[PDB]
From a paper:
The nuclear receptor PPARγ is a pivotal transcription factor regulating mammalian adipogenesis and adipocyte functions. The protein kinase CDK5 can phosphorylate the serine (Ser) 245 residue of PPARγ. The phosphorylated PPARγ at Ser245 is associated with the down-regulation of insulin-sensitizing adiponectin production. Butyrolactone I functions as a PPARγ partial agonist.
To elucidate the binding mode of butyrolactone I to PPARγ, the crystal structure of PPARγ LBD in complex with butyrolactone I was determined at 2.1 Å resolution. The crystal structure of butyrolactone I-bound PPARγ LBD adopted the canonical nuclear receptor fold consisting of three layers of 13 α-helices and 4 stranded β-sheet. Butyrolactone I was bound to the canonical ligand-binding pocket (LBP) via three hydrogen bonds and hydrophobic effects. The oxygen atom of the benzyl group and the oxygen atom of the lactone group in butyrolactone I formed hydrogen bonds with Oγ atom of Ser342 (hydrogen bond distance 3.3 Å) and with the backbone oxygen atoms of Leu340 (hydrogen bond distance 3.0 Å), respectively. The oxygen atom of hydroxylphenyl group in butyrolactone I participated in a water-mediated hydrogen bond with Oη atom of Tyr327 (hydrogen bond distances 2.6 Å and 2.5 Å). The hydrophobic effects of butyrolactone I were presented mostly with H3, H5, and β-sheet of PPARγ LBD, including Ile281, Cys285, Arg288, Ser289, Ala292, Ile326, Leu330, Leu333, Ile341, and Met364. In particular, the 3-methyl-2-butenyl group of butyrolactone I was surrounded by hydrophobic residues, including Ile281, Met348, Leu353, and Met364, which formed a hydrophobic pocket. On the contrary, butyrolactone I did not directly interact with the Oη atom of Tyr473 on H12 that is known for the major interactive motif of the PPARγ full agonist in PPARγ LBD. While the thiazolidinedione moiety of rosiglitazone formed a hydrogen bond with the Oη atom of Tyr473 at a distance of 2.8 Å, butyrolactone I did not interact with Tyr473 since the distance between the oxygen atom of hydroxylphenyl group in butyrolactone I and the Oη atom of Tyr473 was 7.6 Å. Consistent with previous studies, Ser245 phosphorylation inhibition by butyrolactone I could be attributed to the binding of butyrolactone I to the hydrophobic pocket and interacting with several residues on the β-sheet, including Ser342.
Author numbering:
A (entry chain B): 207 to 239, 244 to 263, 275 to 473
B (entry chain A): 205 to 263, 275 to 477
């Protein structure tokens, strides 16, 4: 019966590796020392465009949104590999992904961050924390709360096999508004929570109450998400130069 | 068999995303139209009085109010197709300008493909299938509004005879969006590679779902010629409206789609 939880752990690890090119293992190997191009100022950014692929702060934010949409499809694919997920009411699958992707993006973004900056373009670049802080308000305070979260999150020293199960727990949240059949969602999350618990005991025997400490980080995650939504409004309200091509507006 | 297993998974994925993106499926449309039902029975608009009463029953000039109404729903349909497109594996990975190009030229061919699901020889479901507007009433509309819908009906009765279900249409409308032959595409090869995979997916789906339908795949692909022609006539008809009805307002998103279209 513990054998089924190990099978679930391995299953989610295998699907996580398939769905996400840039693992934490890979990201960590880079961040510590195929060296990446560093963006530390406007001049290094300008030259960066030759491998990054009107105003600086707006172009960066927009680029980030384009790449965020690419990640949502990777997470959607991963979600369909979670035992029981596709058997749920189709409206509930949509609800769980709509509310879940933001929490997952910031969880996985921590894998790409240290206190000094963040890997960009599947590890091709490194944009410095200071450069992002240096953008004219309100763009200068967008990434900073994410860095704060990442520093505290990365102190848990989770690996990819741990994060694979954790991400599944996030997706199967029974408290998303508008859910029609909460029972099988909580029943799957119960099984994932059991699998995560055993994973963290076996993988981190020396790490006392790591399970508890990880679940507590959900608080921080949700604050980071609501804070981003609120700052997305300040943009929509007061930004004249944000108006993209009407058909691009639709995709985002 | 392992290769064909990945094509079944792609068809599954696309159908699943089709159900999520499109509130009114062919399956629901046909259940309303084939008049089996007591709860799903539509109110029928066939004349002015039934249109007037339809205003209370369903939730300026007549021909204009109907045309302004189709405009707004077309916009809402562009939204649904755009949401579907994002779900097609590889689409959001493509160049940003090419994503815009594929949608610009693709959405109207998809609108008319899926409008067929809502049509029989006698008329078309309106207001999410609550209403039904007769083909005769639409044809009797003041020139040039009288012949906007008739070419869609002509296409629909022929297309509908292929007897495709939603699981077929999900892969077909994906094949339409990933068209490498669109004017102004910067990188064609990555589009063609996605369409290759979609076409394999469609071919196995039509073979498994329609075993006794000879060359249904080839016959479906030929219908893409008919869609192309319906869009041209539609655009020509809009040019006439702009000049004849200067007081009538086209939607910017639709204007942007129509801007320098062939
Ligand atoms: C989970 O990770 C991600 O989704 C991202 C998306 C992404 C990919 C390539 C990129 O060049 C960017 C641009 C990142 C910035 C900070 C302008 C984002 O992949 C990243 O390497 C990265 O830094 C991401 C990212 C996502 C959301 C953000 O708010 C910031 C970065
Ligand atoms: C989903 O239903 C359709 O496809 C349309 C849109 C439609 C929806 C509700 C409506 O009330 C109407 C007609 C408008 C009034 C004010 C009675 C049209 O219903 C139609 O009869 C019709 O012709 C629709 C249509 C046609 C062409 C398009 O490009 C888009 C929608």
């Amino acid at each position: 019966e513990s054998a089924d939880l190990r099978a679930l752990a391995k299953h989610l690890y295998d699907s996580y590796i398939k769905s996400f090119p840039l693992t934490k293992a890979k990201a960590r190997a880079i961040l510590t020392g195929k060296s990446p191009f560093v963006i530390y100022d406007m001049n290094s950014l300008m030259m960066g465009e030759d491998k990054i692929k009107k105003e600086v702060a707006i172009r960066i934010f927009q680029g980030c949104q384009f790449r965020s949409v690419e990640a949502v499809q990777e997470i959607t694919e991963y979600a369909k590999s979670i035992p029981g997920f596709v058997n749920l009411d189709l409206n509930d699958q949509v609800t769980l992904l709509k509310y879940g992707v933001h929490e997952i993006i910031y969880t996985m973004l921590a894998s790409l961050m240290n206190k000094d900056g963040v890997l960009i373009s599947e590890g091709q670049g490194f944009m410095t924390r200071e450069f992002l802080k240096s953008l004219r308000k309100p763009f200068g305070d967008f990434m900073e709360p994410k860095f704060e979260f990442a520093v505290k999150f990365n102190a848990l020293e989770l690996d990819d096999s741990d994060l694979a199960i954790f991400i599944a727990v996030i997706i199967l949240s029974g408290d998303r508004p508008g859910l029609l059949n909460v029972k099988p969602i909580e029943d799957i999350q119960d099984n994932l929570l059991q699998a995560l618990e055993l994973q963290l005991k076996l993988n981190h025997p020396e790490s006392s109450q790591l399970f508890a400490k990880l679940l507590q980080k959900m608080t921080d995650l949700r604050q980071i998400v609501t804070e981003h939504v609120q700052l997305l409004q300040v943009i929509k309200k007061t930004e004249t130069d944000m108006s993209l091509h009407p058909l691009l507006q639709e995709i985002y």
